[PDB]
Design a protein around this ligand. Sequence first.
Ligand SMILES: NC(=O)Nc1sc(-c2ccccc2)cc1C(N)=O
Length: 261
Amino acid sequence: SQLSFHRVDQKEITQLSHLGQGTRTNVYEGRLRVELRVVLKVLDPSHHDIALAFYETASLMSQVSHTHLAFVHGVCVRGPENIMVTEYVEHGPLDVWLRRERGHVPMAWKMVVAQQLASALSYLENKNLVHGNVCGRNILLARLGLAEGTSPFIKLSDPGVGLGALSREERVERIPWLAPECLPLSTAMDKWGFGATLLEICFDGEAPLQSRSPSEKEHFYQRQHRLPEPQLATLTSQCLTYEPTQRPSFRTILRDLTRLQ
Ligand SMILES: NC(=O)Nc1sc(-c2ccccc2)cc1C(N)=O
């Protein structure tokens, strides 16, 4: 093993406006010259394992292609700062967009988005690679598709700092997207995240257990409580099965989403 990713020189990037924060990151709009519109993910000063995890994600995402996976252009080191350089996708995070468009996103639109997500994720399953952070915030909207005769187009972004390097406190915050087996490893975890993401999508960007304290989210998992029903219901319940070996394959998930729309 030896990572593979493009090294970007600090001269080749321009840092523009702050977009928000990811896990141990600050995220900015930028420009990449040899000019590409890009996103810059500046890793906070942090333990070395966080840094290694960041690089492991850049390497992973630098070696996969898909219609519905966002590009990773490289990594730029700017003195003590490590910066992942990624695709700017026009309309930003899906969760933010859904909350703003709450009430007038039709179920048929959500079905297309779901089918796109599933096919991205079936490709990673085929490659036996784990994403580890499927949630609406990591789904970026390239086309709105709300206009008559158009259809939406999403891209799944990089998972950022790997799950294994995060604190237990951080993993709790990711409930219900976090697979229960990860609270105390496989491609199975993304079936849970997918399920949790489908609920998030069905509820116009509100995910379940958002009004719950960390202790309550933990307790929900400990008592293996069942998450609400969106009929994507069968599918979502299948994905949101605590036992990883009972979650259906993306081949099945995708075949099912097709013969639904
Ligand atoms: N590749 C990638 O992740 N692109 C991202 S991340 C992001 C973002 C992240 C955290 C808070 C708010 C926005 C926006 C965009 C974008 N518009 O493409």
